[PDB]
Coordinates of C-alpha atoms and ligand atoms in Angstrom, one line a residue:
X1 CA -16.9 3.9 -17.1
X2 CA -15.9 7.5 -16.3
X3 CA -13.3 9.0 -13.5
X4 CA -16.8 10.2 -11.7
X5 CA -18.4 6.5 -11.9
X6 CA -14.6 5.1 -10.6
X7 CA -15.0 7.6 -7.1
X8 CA -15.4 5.2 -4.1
X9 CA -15.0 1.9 -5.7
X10 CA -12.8 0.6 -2.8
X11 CA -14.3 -0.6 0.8
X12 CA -12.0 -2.1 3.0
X13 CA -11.5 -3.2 7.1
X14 CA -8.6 -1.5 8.7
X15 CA -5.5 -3.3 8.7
X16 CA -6.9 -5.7 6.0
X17 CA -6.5 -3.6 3.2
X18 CA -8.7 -2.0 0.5
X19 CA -10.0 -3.9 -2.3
X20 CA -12.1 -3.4 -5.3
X21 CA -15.0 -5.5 -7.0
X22 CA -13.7 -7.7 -9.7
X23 CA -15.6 -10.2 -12.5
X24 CA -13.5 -13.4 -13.6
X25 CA -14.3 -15.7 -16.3
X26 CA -17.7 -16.0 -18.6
X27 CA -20.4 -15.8 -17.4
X28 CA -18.6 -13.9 -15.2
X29 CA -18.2 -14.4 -11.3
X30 CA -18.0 -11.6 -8.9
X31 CA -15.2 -11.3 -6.4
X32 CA -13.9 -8.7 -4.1
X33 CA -10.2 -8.4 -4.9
X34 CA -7.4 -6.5 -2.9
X35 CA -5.5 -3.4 -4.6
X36 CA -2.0 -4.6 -4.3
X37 CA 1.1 -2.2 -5.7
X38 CA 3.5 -4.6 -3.9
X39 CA 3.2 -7.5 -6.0
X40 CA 2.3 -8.1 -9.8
X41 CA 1.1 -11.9 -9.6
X42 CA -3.3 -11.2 -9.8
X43 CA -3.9 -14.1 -7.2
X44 CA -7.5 -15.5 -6.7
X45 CA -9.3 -18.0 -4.7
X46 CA -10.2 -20.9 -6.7
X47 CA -11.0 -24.0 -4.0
X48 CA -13.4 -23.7 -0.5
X49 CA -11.9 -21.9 2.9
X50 CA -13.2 -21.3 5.9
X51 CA -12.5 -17.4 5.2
X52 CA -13.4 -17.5 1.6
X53 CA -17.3 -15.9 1.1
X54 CA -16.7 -17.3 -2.9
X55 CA -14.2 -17.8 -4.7
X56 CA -13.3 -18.6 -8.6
X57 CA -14.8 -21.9 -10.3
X58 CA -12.8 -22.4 -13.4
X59 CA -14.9 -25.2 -15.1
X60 CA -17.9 -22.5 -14.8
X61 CA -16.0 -20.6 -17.2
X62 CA -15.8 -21.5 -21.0
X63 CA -13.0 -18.8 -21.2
X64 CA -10.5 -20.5 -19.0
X65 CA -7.9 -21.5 -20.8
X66 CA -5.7 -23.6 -18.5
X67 CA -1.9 -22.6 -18.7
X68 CA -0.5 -26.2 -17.5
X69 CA 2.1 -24.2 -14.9
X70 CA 1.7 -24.7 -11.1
X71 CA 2.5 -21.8 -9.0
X72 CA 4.2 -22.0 -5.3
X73 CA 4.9 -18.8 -3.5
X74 CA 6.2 -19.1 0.0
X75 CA 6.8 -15.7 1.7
X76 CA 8.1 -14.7 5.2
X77 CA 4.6 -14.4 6.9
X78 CA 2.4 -17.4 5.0
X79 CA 1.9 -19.1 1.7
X80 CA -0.1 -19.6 -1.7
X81 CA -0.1 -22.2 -4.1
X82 CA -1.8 -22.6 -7.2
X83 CA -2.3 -23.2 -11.1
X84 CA -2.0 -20.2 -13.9
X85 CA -4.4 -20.0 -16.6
X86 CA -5.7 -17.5 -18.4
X87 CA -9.3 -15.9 -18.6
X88 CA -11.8 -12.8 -19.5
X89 CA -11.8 -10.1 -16.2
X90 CA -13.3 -6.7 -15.8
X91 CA -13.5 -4.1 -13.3
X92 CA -17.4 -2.8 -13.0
X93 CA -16.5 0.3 -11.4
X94 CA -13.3 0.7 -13.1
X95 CA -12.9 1.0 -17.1
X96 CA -15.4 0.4 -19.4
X97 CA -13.1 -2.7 -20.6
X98 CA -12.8 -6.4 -20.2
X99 CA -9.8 -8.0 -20.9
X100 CA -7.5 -11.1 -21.2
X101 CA -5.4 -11.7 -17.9
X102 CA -3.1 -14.4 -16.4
X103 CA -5.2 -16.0 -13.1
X104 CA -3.2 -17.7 -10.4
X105 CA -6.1 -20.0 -9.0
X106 CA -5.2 -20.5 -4.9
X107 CA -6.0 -24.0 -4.5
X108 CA -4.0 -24.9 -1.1
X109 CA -2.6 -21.3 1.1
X110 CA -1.8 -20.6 4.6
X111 CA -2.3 -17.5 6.7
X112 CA -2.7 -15.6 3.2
X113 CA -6.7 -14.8 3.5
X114 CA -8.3 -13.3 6.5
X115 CA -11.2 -14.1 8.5
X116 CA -13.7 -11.3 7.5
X117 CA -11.5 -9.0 5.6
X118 CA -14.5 -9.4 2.5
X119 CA -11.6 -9.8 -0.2
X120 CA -11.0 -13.5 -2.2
X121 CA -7.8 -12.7 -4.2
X122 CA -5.0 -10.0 -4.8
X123 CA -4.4 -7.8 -8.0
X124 CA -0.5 -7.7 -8.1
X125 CA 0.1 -3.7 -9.1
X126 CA 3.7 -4.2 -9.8
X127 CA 6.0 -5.3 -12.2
X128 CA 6.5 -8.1 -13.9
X129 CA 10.5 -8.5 -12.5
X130 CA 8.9 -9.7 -9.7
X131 CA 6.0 -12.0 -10.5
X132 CA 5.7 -15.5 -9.9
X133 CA 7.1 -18.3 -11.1
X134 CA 9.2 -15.6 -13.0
X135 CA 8.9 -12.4 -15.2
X136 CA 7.3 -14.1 -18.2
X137 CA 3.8 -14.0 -16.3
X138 CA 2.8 -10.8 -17.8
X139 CA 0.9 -8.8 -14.8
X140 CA -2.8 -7.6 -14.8
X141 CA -2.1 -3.7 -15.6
X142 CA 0.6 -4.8 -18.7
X143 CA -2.3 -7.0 -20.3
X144 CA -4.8 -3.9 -19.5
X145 CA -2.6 -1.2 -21.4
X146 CA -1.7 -3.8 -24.5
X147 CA -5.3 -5.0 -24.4
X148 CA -7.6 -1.8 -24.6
X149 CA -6.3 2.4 -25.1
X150 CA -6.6 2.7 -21.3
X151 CA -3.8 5.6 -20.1
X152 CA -0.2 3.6 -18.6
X153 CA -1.4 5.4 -15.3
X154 CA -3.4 4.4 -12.0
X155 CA -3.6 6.2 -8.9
X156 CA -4.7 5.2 -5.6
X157 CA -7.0 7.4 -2.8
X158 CA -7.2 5.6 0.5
X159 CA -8.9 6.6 3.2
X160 CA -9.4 5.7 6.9
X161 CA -13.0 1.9 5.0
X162 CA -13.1 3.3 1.7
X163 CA -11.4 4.9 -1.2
X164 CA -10.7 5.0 -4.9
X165 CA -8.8 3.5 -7.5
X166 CA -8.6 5.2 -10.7
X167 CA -7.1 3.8 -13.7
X168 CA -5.9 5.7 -17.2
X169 CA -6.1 8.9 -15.2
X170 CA -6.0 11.5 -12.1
X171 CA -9.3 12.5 -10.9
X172 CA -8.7 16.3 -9.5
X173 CA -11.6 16.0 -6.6
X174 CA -9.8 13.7 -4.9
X175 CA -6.8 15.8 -4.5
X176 CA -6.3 19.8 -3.1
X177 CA -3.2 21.7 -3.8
X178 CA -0.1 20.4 -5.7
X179 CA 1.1 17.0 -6.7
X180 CA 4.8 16.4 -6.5
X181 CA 6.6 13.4 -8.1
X182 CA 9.6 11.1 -7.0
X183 CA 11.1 8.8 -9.4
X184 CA 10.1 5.3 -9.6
X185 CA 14.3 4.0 -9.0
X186 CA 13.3 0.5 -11.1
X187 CA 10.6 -0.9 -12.2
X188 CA 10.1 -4.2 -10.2
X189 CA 8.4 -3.0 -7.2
X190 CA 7.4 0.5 -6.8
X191 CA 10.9 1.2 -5.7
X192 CA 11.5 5.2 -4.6
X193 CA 14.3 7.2 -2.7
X194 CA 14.1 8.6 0.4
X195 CA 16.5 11.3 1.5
X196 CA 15.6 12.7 4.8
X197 CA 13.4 11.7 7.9
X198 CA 12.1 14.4 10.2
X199 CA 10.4 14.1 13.3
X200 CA 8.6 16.8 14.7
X201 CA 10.8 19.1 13.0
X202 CA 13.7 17.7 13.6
X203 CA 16.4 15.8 11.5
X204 CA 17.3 11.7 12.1
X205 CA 21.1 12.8 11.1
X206 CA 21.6 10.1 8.8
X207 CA 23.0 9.2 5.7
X208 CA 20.2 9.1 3.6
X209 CA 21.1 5.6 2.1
X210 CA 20.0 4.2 5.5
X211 CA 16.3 4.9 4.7
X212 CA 16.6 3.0 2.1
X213 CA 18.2 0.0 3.1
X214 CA 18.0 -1.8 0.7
X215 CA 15.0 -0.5 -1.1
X216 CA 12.2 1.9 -0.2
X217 CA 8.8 0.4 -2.0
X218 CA 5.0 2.4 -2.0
X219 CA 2.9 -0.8 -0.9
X220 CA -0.6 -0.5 -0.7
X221 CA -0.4 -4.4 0.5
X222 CA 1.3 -3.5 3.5
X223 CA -0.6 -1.9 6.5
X224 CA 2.7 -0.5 8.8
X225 CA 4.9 2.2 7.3
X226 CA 7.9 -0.4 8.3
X227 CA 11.4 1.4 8.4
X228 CA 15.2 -0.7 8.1
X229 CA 16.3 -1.4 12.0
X230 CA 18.6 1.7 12.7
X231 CA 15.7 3.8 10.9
X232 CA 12.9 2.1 13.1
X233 CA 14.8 2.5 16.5
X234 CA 16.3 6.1 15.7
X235 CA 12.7 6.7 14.8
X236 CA 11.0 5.1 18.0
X237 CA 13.8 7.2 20.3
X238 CA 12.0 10.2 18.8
X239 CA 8.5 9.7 19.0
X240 CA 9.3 8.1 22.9
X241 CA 10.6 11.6 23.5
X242 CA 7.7 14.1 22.0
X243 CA 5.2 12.0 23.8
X244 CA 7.5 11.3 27.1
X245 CA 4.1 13.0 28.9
X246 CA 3.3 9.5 28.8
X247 CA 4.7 6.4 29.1
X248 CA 3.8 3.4 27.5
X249 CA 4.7 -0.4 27.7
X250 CA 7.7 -1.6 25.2
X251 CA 4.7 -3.9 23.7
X252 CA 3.4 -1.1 22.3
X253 CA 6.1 0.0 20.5
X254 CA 6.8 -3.3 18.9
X255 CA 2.9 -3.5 17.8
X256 CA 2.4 -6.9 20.3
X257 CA 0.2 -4.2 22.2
X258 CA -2.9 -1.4 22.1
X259 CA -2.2 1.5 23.7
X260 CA -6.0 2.7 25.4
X261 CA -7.5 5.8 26.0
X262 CA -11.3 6.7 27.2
X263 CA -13.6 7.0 24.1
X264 CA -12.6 10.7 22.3
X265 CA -9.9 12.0 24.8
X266 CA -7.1 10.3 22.9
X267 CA -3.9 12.9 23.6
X268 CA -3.2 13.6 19.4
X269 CA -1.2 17.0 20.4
X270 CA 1.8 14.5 22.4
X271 CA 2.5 12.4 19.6
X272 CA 4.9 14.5 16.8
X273 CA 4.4 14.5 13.0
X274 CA 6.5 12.8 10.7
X275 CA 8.0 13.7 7.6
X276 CA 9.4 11.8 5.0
X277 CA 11.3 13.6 2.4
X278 CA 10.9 11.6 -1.0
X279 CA 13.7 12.4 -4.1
X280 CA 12.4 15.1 -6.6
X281 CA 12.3 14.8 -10.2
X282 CA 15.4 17.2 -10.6
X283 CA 18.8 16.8 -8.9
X284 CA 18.9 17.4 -5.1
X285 CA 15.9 18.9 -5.1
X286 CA 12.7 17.1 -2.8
X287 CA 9.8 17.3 -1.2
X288 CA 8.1 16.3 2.3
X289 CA 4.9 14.0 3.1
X290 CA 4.4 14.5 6.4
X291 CA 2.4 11.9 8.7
X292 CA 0.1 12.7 11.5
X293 CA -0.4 10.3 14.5
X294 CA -4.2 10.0 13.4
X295 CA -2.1 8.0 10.6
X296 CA 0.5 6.0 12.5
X297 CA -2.1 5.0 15.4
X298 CA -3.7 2.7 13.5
X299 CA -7.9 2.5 15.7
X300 CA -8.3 -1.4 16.1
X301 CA -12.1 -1.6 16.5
X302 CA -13.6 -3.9 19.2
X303 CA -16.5 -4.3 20.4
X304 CA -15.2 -5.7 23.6
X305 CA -12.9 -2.4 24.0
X306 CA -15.5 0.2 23.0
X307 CA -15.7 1.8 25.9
X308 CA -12.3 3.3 24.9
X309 CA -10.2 4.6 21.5
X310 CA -7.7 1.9 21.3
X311 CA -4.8 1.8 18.7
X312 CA -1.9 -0.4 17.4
X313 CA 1.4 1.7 16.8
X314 CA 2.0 0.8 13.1
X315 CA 5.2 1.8 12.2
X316 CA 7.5 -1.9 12.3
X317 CA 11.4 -2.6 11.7
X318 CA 12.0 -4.4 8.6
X319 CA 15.1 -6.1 7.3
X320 CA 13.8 -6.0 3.8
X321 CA 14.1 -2.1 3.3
X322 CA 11.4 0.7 4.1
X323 CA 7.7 0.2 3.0
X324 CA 5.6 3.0 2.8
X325 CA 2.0 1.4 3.6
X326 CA -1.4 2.0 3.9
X327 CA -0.7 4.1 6.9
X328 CA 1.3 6.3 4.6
X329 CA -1.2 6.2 1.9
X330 CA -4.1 7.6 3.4
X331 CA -4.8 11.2 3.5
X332 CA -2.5 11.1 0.3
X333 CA -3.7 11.1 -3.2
X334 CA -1.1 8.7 -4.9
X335 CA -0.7 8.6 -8.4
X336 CA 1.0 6.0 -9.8
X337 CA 2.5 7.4 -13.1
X338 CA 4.0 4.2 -15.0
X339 CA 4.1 6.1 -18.3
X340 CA 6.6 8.2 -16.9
X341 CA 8.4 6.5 -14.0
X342 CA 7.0 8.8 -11.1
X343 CA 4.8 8.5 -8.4
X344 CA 3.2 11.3 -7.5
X345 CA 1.7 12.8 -4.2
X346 CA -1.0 15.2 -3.0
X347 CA -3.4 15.7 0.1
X348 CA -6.4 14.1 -0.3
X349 CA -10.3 14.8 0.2
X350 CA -10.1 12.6 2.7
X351 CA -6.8 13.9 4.2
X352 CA -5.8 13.9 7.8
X353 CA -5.9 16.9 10.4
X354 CA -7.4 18.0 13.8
X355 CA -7.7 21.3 14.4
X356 CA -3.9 21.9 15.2
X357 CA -2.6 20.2 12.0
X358 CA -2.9 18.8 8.6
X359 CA -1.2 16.1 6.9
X360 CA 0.9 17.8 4.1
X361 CA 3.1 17.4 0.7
X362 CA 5.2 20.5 0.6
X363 CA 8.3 21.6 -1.7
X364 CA 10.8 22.2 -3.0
X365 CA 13.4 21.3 -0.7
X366 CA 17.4 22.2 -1.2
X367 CA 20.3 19.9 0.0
X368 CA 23.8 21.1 -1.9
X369 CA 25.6 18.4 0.3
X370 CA 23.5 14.9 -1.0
X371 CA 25.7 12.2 -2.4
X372 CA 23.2 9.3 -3.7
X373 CA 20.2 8.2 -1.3
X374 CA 20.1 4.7 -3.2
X375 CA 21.5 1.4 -2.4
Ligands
7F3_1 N1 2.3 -6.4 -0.6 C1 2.0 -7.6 -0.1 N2 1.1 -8.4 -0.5 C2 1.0 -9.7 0.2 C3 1.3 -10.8 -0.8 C4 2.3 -11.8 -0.6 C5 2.5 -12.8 -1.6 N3 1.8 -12.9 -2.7 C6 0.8 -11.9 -2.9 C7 0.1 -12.0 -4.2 F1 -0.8 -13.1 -4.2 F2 -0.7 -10.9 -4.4 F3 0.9 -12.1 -5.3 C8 0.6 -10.9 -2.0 C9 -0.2 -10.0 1.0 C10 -0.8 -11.2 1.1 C11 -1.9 -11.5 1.9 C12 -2.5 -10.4 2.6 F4 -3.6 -10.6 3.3 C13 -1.9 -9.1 2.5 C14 -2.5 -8.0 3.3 C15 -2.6 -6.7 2.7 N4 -3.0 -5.6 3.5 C16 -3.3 -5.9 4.8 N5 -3.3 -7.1 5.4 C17 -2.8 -8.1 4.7 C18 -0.8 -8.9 1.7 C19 2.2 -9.5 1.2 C20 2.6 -10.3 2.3 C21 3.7 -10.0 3.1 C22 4.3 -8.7 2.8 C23 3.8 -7.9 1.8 F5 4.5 -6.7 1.6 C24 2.8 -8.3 1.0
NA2 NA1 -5.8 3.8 9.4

């Protein structure tokens, strides 16, 4: 149950996330679960679907202990409903451990699992503030830490699928140069601050609370990097005019359409990098991730299509604040530092870059004239 036996225990299918393998109950029942730092409810299958492969069956179990508490959690896109109980759950290629953990058993959801995305349930990464029914259902990685001497401390390598997850520790052949940390701002979501946008070098001009209106979350949940409206369409103004070689339909830029290109010739050079500068761990000081279109071109394989490299733009307006998503993610060796309230950043192995470019975390970063960046 070493670091070196936790490399490449995530598979996933683009745009469906990344998820790890997973044993509930005793004896105990295999399940591929999705790594999820935007919510902290662990959320399993636990009644027949037409996209489930398995899913969890409780009176297999002699551990279950049922919790007598429903759970309902409609959210802007879909739904899940269930019932919380509580049973044994290990990680094969994670720690060495099995533990006690909270189980929300999905009996009834809508537009919640995927047709062939290979993953039955969701391991909530988060905090407690915001599981469901309420903050009393202690999340998966709190009953970990109590439970066994595993390190307060998880970090996340995606790449674009595959990847690893490693928990109590940072694993330094998944990472090259430095790793630079931003403060987590509270501890409900991964909540961060955001102080300057860049795009191909050159400044969105403004105030930095705008980026992170009304939070800025790292969501491994989320494919899009999704930016507040003024962000998105200051953004979108920008990337239309470095790549104005080209024109393509508004559909595209509101992700309702691929953009197409003959197998291998897709034109990389016309589309600008872009950088997000995260807060530093000292005042006004930061530093830059910076995003390369082979990142925010998201390749939506098709068989039907394969004569051509076609790609969804995934970068989305949100109303709900930034989210830095998969798309931002990968390439990026992200180590979620719970111990001591930072998330840290570094290029990873599997990091992004042609031969023009690379994706980058670079700093430090100076800016005398910063009032706060937070909402
Ligand atoms: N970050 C999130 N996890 C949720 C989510 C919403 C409500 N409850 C949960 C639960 F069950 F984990 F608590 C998760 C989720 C649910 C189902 C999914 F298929 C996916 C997903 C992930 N990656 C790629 N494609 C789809 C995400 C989800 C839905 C909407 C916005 C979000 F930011 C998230
Ligand atoms: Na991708």
């Amino acid at each position: 149950g070493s670091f070196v036996e936790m490399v490449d225990n995530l598979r996933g299918k683009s745009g469906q996330g990344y998820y790890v393998e997973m044993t509930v109950g005793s004896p105990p029942q295999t399940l591929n679960i999705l790594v999820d730092t935007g919510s902290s409810n662990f959320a399993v299958g636990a009644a027949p679907h037409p996209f489930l492969h398995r899913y969890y069956q409780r009176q297999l179990s002699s551990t279950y202990r049922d919790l007598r508490k429903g759970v309902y959690v409609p959210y802007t896109q879909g739904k899940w409903e269930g019932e919380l109980g509580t049973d044994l759950v290990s990680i094969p290629h994670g720690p060495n451990v099995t533990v006690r953990a909270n189980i929300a058993a999905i009996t009834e959801s809508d537009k919640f699992f995927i047709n062939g995305s290979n993953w039955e349930g969701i391991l909530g990464l988060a905090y407690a503030e915001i599981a469901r029914p309420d903050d009393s259902l202690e999340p998966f990685f709190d009953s970990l830490v109590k439970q066994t001497h595993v390190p307060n401390l998880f970090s996340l390598q995606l790449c674009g699928v595959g990847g690893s997850m490693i928990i109590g520790g940072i694993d330094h052949s998944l990472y090259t140069g430095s790793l630079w940390y931003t403060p987590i701002r509270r501890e409900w979501y991964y909540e961060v601050i955001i102080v300057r946008v860049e795009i191909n070098g050159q400044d969105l001009k403004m105030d930095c609370k705008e980026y992170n209106y009304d939070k800025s979350i790292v969501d491994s949940g989320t494919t899009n990097l999704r930016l507040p409206k003024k962000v998105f369409e200051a953004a979108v103004k920008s990337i239309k005019a470095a790549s104005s070689t080209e024109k393509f339909p508004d559909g595209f830029w509101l992700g309702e359409q691929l953009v197409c290109w003959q197998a291998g010739t897709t034109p990389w050079n016309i589309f600008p990098v872009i950088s997000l500068y995260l807060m530093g761990e000292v005042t006004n000081q930061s530093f830059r991730i910076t995003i390369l279109p082979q990142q925010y071109l998201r390749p939506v394989e098709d068989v039907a299509t394969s004569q051509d490299d076609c790609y969804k733009f995934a970068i989305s307006q949100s109303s709900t604040g930034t989210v830095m998503g998969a798309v931002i993610m990968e390439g990026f060796y992200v180590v979620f530092d719970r111990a001591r309230k930072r998330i840290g950043f570094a290029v990873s192995a599997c990091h992004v870059h042609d031969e023009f470019r690379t994706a980058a975390v670079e700093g430090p970063f100076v800016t005398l004239d910063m009032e706060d960046c937070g909402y």
